[PDB]
């Protein structure tokens, strides 16, 4: 997963 949280 490139963007872990919100970005």
């Amino acid at each position: 997963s490139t963007c872990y949280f919100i970005m």
Partner: antibody
Amino acid sequence: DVQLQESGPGLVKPSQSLSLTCTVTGYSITSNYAWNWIRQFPGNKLEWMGFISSYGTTTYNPSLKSRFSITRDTSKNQFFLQLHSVTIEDTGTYFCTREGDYWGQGTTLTVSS
Amino acid sequence: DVVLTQTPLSLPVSLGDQASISCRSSQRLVHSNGNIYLHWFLQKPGQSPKLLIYKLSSRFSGVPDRFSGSGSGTDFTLKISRVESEDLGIYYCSQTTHVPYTFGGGTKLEIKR
């Protein structure tokens, strides 16, 4: 202890190329999170430029006219915004962030001849 | 790209009063995983934007319960129940469901006289 600090030239001439450095302390840029670059112009417009994954892969804003790329140096715990052949329209504040949760102070870039 | 439109551009409020900022999206912001990546940031003068609400209604760490995020479809809202002097600055809606990530133009929360 998670902190970010932008650094760069401050003033460049139109057509020159450029690196802005974001030094990260307290957290490793190889852990989970993406690391983002976001610009702000006078008038308050915020513009997301892109990110570099914890695994070194990039994702850019495809709609921008500025020529740029994002790189990193894991051993120095730093990620960079390479601005290529800048124009007067690239003048503004450049923020690094992790994923909008932690941000640096921002760096002012002026492009003038 | 996704266009985010903020209303109003300037919000004159009295300290202690309730305040509400609206954000209109050009697209639905429901991700494949079911989450709505619509967030709210606050930028105080001389500072970087700070995350208040995220994934539509979650309060970020340290953010008081006076701030709440609401919305569905293309209409999203941020409510401040009791405005304090600390709440003054520019409020931005942010969407990160679709790449490129985009922001609204900002809403200035100002004082009434």
